[PDB]
Amino acid sequence: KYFPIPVEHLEEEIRIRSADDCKQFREEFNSLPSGHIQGTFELANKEENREKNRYPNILPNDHSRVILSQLDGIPCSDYINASYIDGYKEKNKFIAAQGPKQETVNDFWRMVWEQKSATIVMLTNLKERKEEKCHQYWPDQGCWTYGNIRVCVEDCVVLVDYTIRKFCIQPQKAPRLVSQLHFTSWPDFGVPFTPIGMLKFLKKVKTLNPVHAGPIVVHCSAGVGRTGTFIVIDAMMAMMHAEQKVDVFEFVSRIRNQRPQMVQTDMQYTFIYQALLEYYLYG
């Protein structure tokens, strides 16, 4: 049983749970529900949708999946591997999405347009470990038309830890500016060496996301691991600021009822706590 942690005990609790090669942290992570028990997965498992999933066992459940408009003449075209995810006291603050495949890039931009999202958070490089993790869904210069959505690149700023790209998007009536915040420094193996860069990135996402926009689209490759780590840190920072407490175990449990297996490894789970401690001490 895991109780909330008051911030004045957070540094000590991290020491305690990190002792013995993170013995208690590993036990805590292994006690989480998976999220597979209560939900249903009929739509993700339809034969027509098999090619739209990157990994057969990483699926949205039916109740929190993002529903796309139906394309005329195309059965089952309402599906995308993406789920709404709650924030701290904010229903459906996020969409956790798999990184698009070549065959789902058009669906991905349909989701961004229809959900009125203004911010995309990309937590993967296109290639990692020599494998394709995400298909490039944006033009490097000029414009490209994905289905009915024309995407034009307006700006690109490369920084040491992340890149910010800005796109003007419009169906082919008023165009919309979409900011892509691309975290480029996550290692191919393990988690970042310190949480300082991720915390700076999280603050930048919060600064750039407009106040009246749709959900922030957050994606990695499968859309559960790094995606979950990002969302949970964001929600627990808000909880810390409002309540002077954090309850990571409860929140991960909660969002796994929206999308199974959010936060994929115990190393990512401990990274969450390390980021929250750094924010409490110095943020």
UniProtKB/Swiss-Prot annotation:
Domain Tyrosine-protein phosphatase positions: 25-279
Domain of life: Eukaryota
Active site, renumbered: 220
Reported modifications of this chain: A catalytically active cytoplasmic form (p65) is produced by proteolytic cleavage of either isoform 1, isoform 2 or isoform 3.
Tissue: Expressed in giant cell tumor (osteoclastoma rich in multinucleated osteoclastic cells).
Signals that turn on the gene: Up-regulated by 12-O-tetradecanoylphorbol-13-acetate (TPA) in HL-60 cells.
Binding, substrate: 188, 220-226, 264
Domain statement: The tyrosine-protein phosphatase 2 domain (D2) mediates dimerization. The extreme N- and C- termini of the D2 domain act to inhibit dimerization and removal of these sequences increases dimerization and inhibits enzyme activity.
Homology family: Belongs to the protein-tyrosine phosphatase family. Receptor class 4 subfamily.
Quaternary structure note: Monomer. Isoform 2: Homodimer. Can form oligomers. Dimerization is increased by oxidative stress and decreased by EGFR. Isoform 2 interacts with GRB2.
The protein's role, per its UniProt record: Isoform 1 plays a critical role in signaling transduction pathways and phosphoprotein network topology in red blood cells. May play a role in osteoclast formation and function.
Protein name: Receptor-type tyrosine-protein phosphatase epsilon
